[PDB]
Design a binder for these strands. Sequence first.
RNA 1: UCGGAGAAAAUCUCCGAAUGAUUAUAACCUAGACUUACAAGUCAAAGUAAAAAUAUCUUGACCCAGAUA
Lengths: 52, 287, 162, 144, 22, 95
Amino acid sequence: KTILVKLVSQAGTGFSFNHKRSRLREKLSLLHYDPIVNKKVLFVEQKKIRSL
Amino acid sequence: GTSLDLLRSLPRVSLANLKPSPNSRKRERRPRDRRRGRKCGRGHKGERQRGTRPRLGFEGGQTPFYIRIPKYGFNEGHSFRHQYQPLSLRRLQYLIDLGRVDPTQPIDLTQLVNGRGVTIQPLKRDYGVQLVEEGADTFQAKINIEVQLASELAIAAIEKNGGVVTTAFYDPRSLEILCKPIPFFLRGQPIPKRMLPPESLVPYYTDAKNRGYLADPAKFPEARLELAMKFGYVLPDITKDELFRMLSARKDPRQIFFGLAPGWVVNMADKKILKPTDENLLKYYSS
Amino acid sequence: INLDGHLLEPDAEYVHWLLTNIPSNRVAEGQETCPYLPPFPARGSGFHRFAFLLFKQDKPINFSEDTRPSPCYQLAQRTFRTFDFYKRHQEAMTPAGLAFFQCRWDDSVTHTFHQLLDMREPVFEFVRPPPYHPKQKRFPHEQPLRYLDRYRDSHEPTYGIY
Amino acid sequence: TFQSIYSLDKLYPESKGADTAWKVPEHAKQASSYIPLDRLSISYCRSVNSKAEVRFHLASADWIEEPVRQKIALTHKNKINKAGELVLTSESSRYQFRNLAECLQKIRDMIAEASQVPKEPSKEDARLQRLRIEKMNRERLRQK
Amino acid sequence: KENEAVAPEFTNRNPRNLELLG
Amino acid sequence: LTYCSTRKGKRKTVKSVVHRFLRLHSGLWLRRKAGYKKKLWKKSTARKKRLREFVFCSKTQSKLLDKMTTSFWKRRNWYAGDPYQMYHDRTNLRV
RNA sequence: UCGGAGAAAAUCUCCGAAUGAUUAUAACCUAGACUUACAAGUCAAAGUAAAAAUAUCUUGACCCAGAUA
Ligand SMILES: [Mg+2]
Ligand SMILES: [Mg+2]
Ligand SMILES: [Mg+2]
Ligand SMILES: [Mg+2]
């Protein structure tokens, strides 16, 4: 029904956090706080972790 | 005293008159009388009464407390971590005051241990002494000391008075010989060499700011001056000092004892020091 | 009057200057019982409120007990409390005017404390009570490692007998 | 004296002198803004932390250059005693060695910040806004 | 000097004191 | 627990305690929180913060762990640069 | 096993959850507390940092295996 994905920061850091999306909805992307950069940056989905 | 006068009057002390100090011994209770007999303190019949209650930590069949907690590396490598006994300038001053550490000659870990000032335990991973700043404000002695670790403020206290502090590394085998030299001379073996620090500790002992024994001597005067300015004291020129030779005395980085070279044998019974002559054995030790 | 001041005494109020027997609008004709002192609010003591009060003078009364030695730079003497003063002359004194300002500390205050008051200037700071901590326990069950820091006094290591 | 391949002489051939480490650096009391310890008077009051007080006369002191002295007096007037001496203290440790260290260090910072012009005003802190806003109201009312 | 006498604790009575301080 | 060993005749440490808890010389024990690495995606941010912390043990739990370990684990260890150097003693404790 | 409603808290009368979609993406740190055998579970001032405050509505330990950096 839904899946657990790994949004990865596009700021060049390796920071990533897991989110949920609907199998039907398009690939996700969000603005989120990167502690290493201390700024808001785009996080784009790269890999699936599990189907929840 | 008046107590001894009482003995004069009283009858002779003898094996028939002995008595222990009052309350020195408790009385043990056998399970014989009605009070302590019968069920004998164990309760009514059951597992705990027959003596077969489960092991310590068992909680009746739920995952015990000491098993449901995540395993975490608090104690990883504990047996391999290095331990440095702490010596405070209060203890150092107190030892000097009562004559237990002579300041005239250089102070090394042998002298500190020899004066019962510190207790070293190589078996429990002691690798030397670290100087502790505590007591610096009241420290007013001029001494030459070698300690495996030292602190910035601890160094300042020693140098401000005009003393010398250097940091030297002793390997696990060398330290045991250093701490108890005589229980070694009695074996009958030649004095071993002192091994160099491990790669991790090399930077610490090759740095002037830490007064490393392998550090560049030319770089010390700059380090001594910067410390003096920071702590608001005037660096004293120790070359003019009468006992400069004693203050500057330092053993070779491959030497354990001041006047004993590696490879010699100490015949304590005959008050002699056998020394080798072979070339390969002399090259081994002089390396 | 400064209302709030008198470093030593809490319930007091210095008189910066009191003109007496002021005849009519004109003020140069008043008897200068007290010369003019510049405002001297101590540093870090907040906003001191100063007020200018005028009494209706019925009959000429000599305020000899209120006259002050001019110049008066012995601040201690400036101690004063209106109620007692008004009570003395309440028969012939009835207030009719008000004007009050509040002032902070300033560099001129340092000049007043030194040049003429001739004393070291006091400095005050706003101090809060220490935070509340429940009584320390031998076993702080389920409490984080920060627990031990809350009850320590010195931030530096000690070594005791070592 | 026994020597080995790892003796300091062999490891560091250039500095083979016996007294190389135990000499005192030549000069160096002029460069790096050396503070003359003798001029300052240092008193230790045991407030537990041992408070340290470094007091010197700003204007009379000659080691500080005159242009700096004027800037320091204006910027740090609050620390100047009635006698004209600059009184700075610290009570942040149980060791007077450390306490004096910040006292001496604070002097060095003062000279530098007074020696180096602080062109940047930086952002306006809320306290500065409160001071500015209340100050502006004074002018409007003062316009009489 | 009697002038130098200062109470250890100040007692600023101005009701708007703390509010103005913020 | 082994109270008297066949070879040495001593008690034995339970190496499950040694791998889970840290003992401060004063007598306290530190532990982690069970589940702090599990299913973090469905845990609230506040919940995760609570899990990451190092926590103390109760009096009875400490009494049990003292029984399960030997004296060697209760000695005073002088590690250079220890990050628990200041937590091995109690200060201002009247109780 | 846990949650919602009645009896009204001891056994009885009923519904649901092993999520779901929405989304502003919701940080770090730290007083004092709730709950609780243990274990797990709640709320949160102050400070700092991002932005220009906000996540809204209705759950399984340890060990052991993995994945990427
Ligand atoms: Mg018996
Ligand atoms: Mg020991
Ligand atoms: Mg609990
Ligand atoms: Mg807040």
